[PDB]
Design a protein around this ligand. Structure first.
Ligand SMILES: [Ca+2]
Ligand SMILES: [Mg+2]
Length: 130
């Protein structure tokens, strides 16, 4: 694709077609990428500003028996440093059925937990590799 956007060593694809969380991830994997992780304030800002107020699936999903949040691209999840990135009151596990996460609010406090079977646009991430 020519639509990939560049920021700090990584390329990002903002989809034009909505998919479920896992179908989105599979699309990313077919393009040599994963649903995006978020590992700094600057990256969170780039993503929510680029999202322009629309909801995008990101790589947030539950893992292990505790149900701690994790990144599908296998970036270790930093719970301490990620607290600042959830919309206040989230993750709220509405209906006991919200096991995936998206960028929802256009703010540094952007993330929401939503049902994985919901269809949203999505964001892939790919490190530049020469
Ligand atoms: Ca929620
Ligand atoms: Mg697309």
């Amino acid at each position: 694709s020519q639509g990939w956007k560049y920021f700090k060593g990584n390329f990002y694809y903002f989809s034009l077609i909505p998919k479920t969380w896992y179908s989105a991830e599979q699309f990313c994997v077919s393009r040599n990428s994963h649903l995006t992780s978020v590992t700094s304030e600057s990256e969170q800002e780039f993503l929510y500003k680029t999202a322009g107020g629309l909801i995008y699936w990101i790589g947030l999903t539950k893992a292990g028996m505790e149900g701690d949040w994790s990144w599908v691209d296998d970036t270790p999840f930093n719970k301490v440093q990620s607290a600042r990135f959830w919309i206040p009151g989230e993750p709220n596990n509405a209906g006991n059925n919200e096991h995936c996460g998206n960028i929802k609010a256009p703010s540094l406090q952007a993330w929401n937990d939503a049902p994985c079977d919901k269809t949203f646009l999505f964001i892939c991430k790919r490190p530049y590799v020469p």
